[PDB]
Amino acid sequence: PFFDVQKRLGLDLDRWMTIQSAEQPHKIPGRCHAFEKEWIECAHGIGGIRAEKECKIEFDDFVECLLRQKTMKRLSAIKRQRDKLIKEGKYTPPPHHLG
Amino acid sequence: MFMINILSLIIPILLAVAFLTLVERKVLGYMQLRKGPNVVGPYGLLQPIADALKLVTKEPLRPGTSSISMFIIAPILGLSLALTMWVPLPMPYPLINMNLGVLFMLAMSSLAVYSILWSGWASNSKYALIGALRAVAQTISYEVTLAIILLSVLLMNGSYTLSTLITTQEHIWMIFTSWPLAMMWFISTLAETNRAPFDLTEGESELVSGFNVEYAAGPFAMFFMAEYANIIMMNAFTAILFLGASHDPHTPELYTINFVLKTLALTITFLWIRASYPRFRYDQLMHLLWKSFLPLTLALCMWHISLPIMTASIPPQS
Amino acid sequence: PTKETAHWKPPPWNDVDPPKDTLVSNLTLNFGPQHPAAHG
Amino acid sequence: PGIVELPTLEDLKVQEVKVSSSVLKAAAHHYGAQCDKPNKEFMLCRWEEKDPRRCLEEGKLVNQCALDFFRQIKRHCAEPFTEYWTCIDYSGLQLFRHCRKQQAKFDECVLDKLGWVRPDLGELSKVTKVKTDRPLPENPYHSRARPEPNPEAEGDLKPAKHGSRLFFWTM
Amino acid sequence: MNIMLTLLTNVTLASLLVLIAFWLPQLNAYSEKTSPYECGFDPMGSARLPFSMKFFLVAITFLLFDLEIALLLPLPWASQTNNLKTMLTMALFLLILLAASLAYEWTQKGLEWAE
Amino acid sequence: MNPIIYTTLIMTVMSGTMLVMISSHWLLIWIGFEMNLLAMIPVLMKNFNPRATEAATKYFLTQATASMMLMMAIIINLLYSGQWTITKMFNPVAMTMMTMALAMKLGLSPFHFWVPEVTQGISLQAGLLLLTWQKLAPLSVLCQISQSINPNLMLTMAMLSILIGGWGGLNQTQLRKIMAYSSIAHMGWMTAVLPYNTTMTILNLLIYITMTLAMFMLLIHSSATTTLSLSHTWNKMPVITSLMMVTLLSMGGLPPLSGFMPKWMIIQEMTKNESIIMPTLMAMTALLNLYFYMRLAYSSSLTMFPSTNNMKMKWQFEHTKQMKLLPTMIVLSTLVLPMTPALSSLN
Amino acid sequence: MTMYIAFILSTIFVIGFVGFSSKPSPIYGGLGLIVSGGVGCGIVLNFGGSFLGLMVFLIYLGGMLVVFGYTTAMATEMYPEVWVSNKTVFGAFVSGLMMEFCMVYYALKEEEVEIIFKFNGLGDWVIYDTGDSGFFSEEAMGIAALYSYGTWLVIVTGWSLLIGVVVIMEITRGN
Amino acid sequence: SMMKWNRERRRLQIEDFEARIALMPLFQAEKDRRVLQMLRENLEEEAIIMKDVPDWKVGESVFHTTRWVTPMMGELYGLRTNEEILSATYGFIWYT
Amino acid sequence: AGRIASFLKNAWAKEPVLVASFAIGGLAIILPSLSPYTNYAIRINRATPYNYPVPLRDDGNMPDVPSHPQDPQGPSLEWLKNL
Amino acid sequence: MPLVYMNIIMAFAIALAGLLMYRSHLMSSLLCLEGMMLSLFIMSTLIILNTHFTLANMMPIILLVFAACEAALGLSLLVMVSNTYGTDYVQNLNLLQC
């Protein structure tokens, strides 16, 4: 913030909610609590323009935990190939996939 | 058999609304020294059938100065919301166990404005355009009081699960704890359904009907069906909310009988009030809630939120 | 000013424009004539 | 970036205790009181390692211990348990409130035959401790090397050389 | 599914009622029926003119109170918190602010239905 | 307008800005923005004339749209990073979106047609409020996010800001309108150096602020809205019109007056960072400002203007409203150049 | 197949929005917003947001009520507009239908639509998360934390609503 | 009356919860095995699925971290029957 | 003295609803601080274990923490039973 | 980013077009403006329910409470131009010109 009265005069005013690894009500963790813990404790007292590159792999792992872009794309590719070869008809899904 | 249960919900409510149009004309008449309808069948039991057939085969006039889309949609909204707003009621085993049943039904209760406004404006008449805004203001200005009353009452129940409300009462009638609140709630209910003491929309001197003026035959009867279904639905709501009953799980029929008796008693109180009292004036009508009802409701809500804390008697959440 | 600036009348000194066409109306009501709430 | 660690289909093969929710909720307090140790150590493993692939053996242990407990209760009063779990099943919330009669009829058997006591309210809720011979999860998150801090600076403030040094200002 | 099935059943049922209502009866369809109505007369040249009104203020203070009602709705869940003292003071703040808004509405005409 | 109601509108506007420059959660920044929006509309409607209604309506529409796009940027960087903390953005289009959302609140780019009009509509005190206080919040947000702003975007936006600020004021006689255009020019001036180093845009904000109070207080000490009306005031208040002239000299940035210092500082740091073409454009275009500045000076003090017969009884009456801080307000906006090193205090 | 409902709930949201933004008669834009909100309540609901969905239901179907309240008061005229009055509204509407239709056709063929950001056409059911909730709803508990952790939020809001009723008083006072 | 009955209801809730804590470990111990069974079944099946594709490293993890994450439910209920995924996602929401 | 009592009487007559609301409200804030059971309500809320009490790794020298869920030592809520 | 995100983002984009590209009506434009915040409300609730951001669960209603306030004044401004000017048609809305 511009004029950070929060840490000067010594109280939290909004910092409780800013990130989702904070003390959530009745210890309900967020979806990416581990990843954002890794990211935050990675980049602490390092400087944003310096920490953005050392804490990179943690950052995109965090972003992929949030959005699952890469994982869902992988699933889409798997489904594409499965439906293609099923339509052109080679194998049948095992009974665990039917019932 | 789910759809069979649905139909067993709608259709009996339809007969209930149908015969309410007979019990009101009998109760009112007996309250004012009139025998009431007893010519169509035994004790007028068949009379609602005849008027329904007449209104179905009465000509539905298309308002020439109107857009038919809303002239047809408004009865749809008013009727369908009124019936689907019966869905989450705690019969001994409620049909749909919605975790926020009370909030669900309170939210749907606000939707009657969305039939009132289109009826009043689309029909395009002076009485219609006046009564639309007047009735809209009525129901919206009483919806707030309904909301704080619901919240303050629920603060002792535990959650918005409307099935556990029975578990809340069990021992004592909930009115014994919130009789000042219920006395407001009931009256606000009387206001939201547009009944003779608080109707203000009919006003058969300067509004005549207010919203159901140009509506004729079927779409006209649909708004009556909505109106006299909200009567039963809100009287049943008040019945469970304040007039609790016993429910043994091995005998579901007992709570059913007790609940229907409570609903009939409350509807009879509705007819009782309308058969006696004069009609409010819009000035006094909104003076009643803005000047008088709302401050008392706010203070009572404060009392009923502070009370569980000081008594160390917060209700169970789950 | 070039051309259209000619039709750009200066604002008044009060900053309030001369009050426009009188919209004051009381929306005449006939309140009848059948109107059975008058003994007919 | 890495592949898998999924244990073999033979590894995650345990006898799945196949009983109903009403039966399980009827056993409950006695089951917990007489089978806490495998359960406690199992989810101590779960919270410490944060890694079920490391706690399959704990799962087998808790399953087998619970199964033994169910075998002993079968060997003894089961008709009171039968009535109790049926009555709990009739409840749509598995409420313990409308079963108290059979509750007594159950609690006495395991008291005078298997030497068990119904845990008091909150008794089976306080956080306990348990010894596990497994080593500590030194890096539960498998975190990498933490970035080095900023270069620490120190030194007393000597006066700025030649004042402001901004354009023509001498001081 | 279930809930959605009930909503579907109700909307279709309502639409059948309106369809029978609007289609079954027979009308001669003569012109002079279309003339509008007002207690014997027609509504002259009105029923769509802009409505010079005053209770607009009541209508808008409705909404302004409805926001705060939404704010205080989470109370039944909120009462199940560890730090009950802060919840008590701050909810009491919310209702006090409700009352203060109503009072300022009151003394400064406001909720007084304008004339 | 109840005096106490007006005070409570004062401090809710000021608290809305304070919430902006003290909060860290992004939602709180938005909340302060609309607190200020919701609070400043009534004071703009204090006079209650149809021009005031026009100005308030245009302000409301522009600022409401801008705040909604602010939440759009908010939601996007939340979606792409899950962090409400105000810092460098992690999605580019979110950064751009916030850039135009704030700019519409500042009046920099073609999102600047509102400010001259709204300034025309409202009273001059509301003009002082609008063109002084309702900049601190968007500038503060732009300062906090200077880590990742598209330099091309900010630079071109500031360039149009100053350019149409200079050109628009040429054909305006209403003092409120020329002041709005001058403020647009100063908006471009600080926002040009915003990406490079925020200390200098803070300094230029301070100088523009002090100059703007020193200006508006002189206007409503002379009670003039048109150039001819100010020209008639060469008589009654000769000292006020002489100070009028000296601060109108401080306007453009003629040395050694105060207004030259921010231009000098901005150009020097722009040249420190290889931007040598860029500063010359505002350096030239400041003459556009100086043009109608000189026109205002000629109408005010340098040339005597034909007064009016009735005007003489005004000689018998004295300004009773003191309108305090005006002396130091003039002085800080005229002679602070020998104190340029003090800029390091802000850093 | 009612599989794609969680998709179509958003889809009817889009084209109910376009007609809402197609600049029709104000009440018809209101109807577009109403169907959009009714179908978006399902979008939040089937994601688990029961309380927030019913909350927006309530407050928003009051909020469009009040914006109606002046539509027949301060916005009607002798000849109210019709959803077929202006010719351009049809063009706006159809331009509303064909854009997201083409984009979803692509997302059904390539699953890598390049419009603005990065998006995959493989439904929405994936993005849900396995887990549990014990005996507490996460959404309700989170919105309940307003009175324990929302220290500043309720204070600043209530202050803003007070200032809001004040400004609503002052601007509409009419001298 | 409400004070005493509500205290009794709190007693009933702590009892029901204590049952929930009692039985949580068994549900967790069955759930991790069940989820790992889904993962392994999908992995073996998708291995046969991906033999033909020239560039698809089998069983890869998109995450650079070696720490195990909770499986995203998509790969959990993947090639499974449509009814299974429909239940797994929208059952609680759709249940009445 | 007399003026305050007369004003209270007039309010109780002129706007009785206002005085009733103001009274019951004024109680609503000042009782919870005065009442001696709100701490017991805090104990009620802390008593309910919405989540699992995850155990601690035993290493010796924690006599306070019970070794077994049936052990006597540890937190107890007999006050809850008596309440 | 699945299709639900596309749909609500795209709904916001057309709300931006509809409100900002004025056709002739001020009331319908602010109606589009309040639909804008509905799109943003749904959008915000999506990630918040998705990622188990338990605290942020209260942000939507908070985001809601202010937004209606804007409309609370918007339509309030609408009457104030309406009683004098006559309609909400913004083409006579020209008096403030220079």
Ligand SMILES: COC1=C(OC)C(=O)C(C/C=C(\C)CC/C=C(/C)CC/C=C(/C)CC/C=C(\C)CC/C=C(/C)CC/C=C(\C)CC/C=C(\C)CC/C=C(\C)CC/C=C(/C)CCC=C(C)C)=C(C)C1=O
């Ligand atoms: C001297 O000075 C005077 C005046 O002034 C100066 C006056 O003013 C007046 C004027 C005063 C009067 C006219 C007095 C009227 C007095 C009466 C005795 C007549 C009225 C009597 C009543 C009992 C009052 C009734 C009114 C009620 C209850 C409410 C009023 C408000 C309404 C909105 C009702 C209006 C009427 C409607 C809507 C029509 C009714 C329609 C129905 C009942 C439809 C029913 C449909 C169904 C049942 C459908 C279901 C059917 C079936 C078969 C179910 C099964 C089917 C399936 C498909 C399942 C006078 C005379 C006067 O002297």
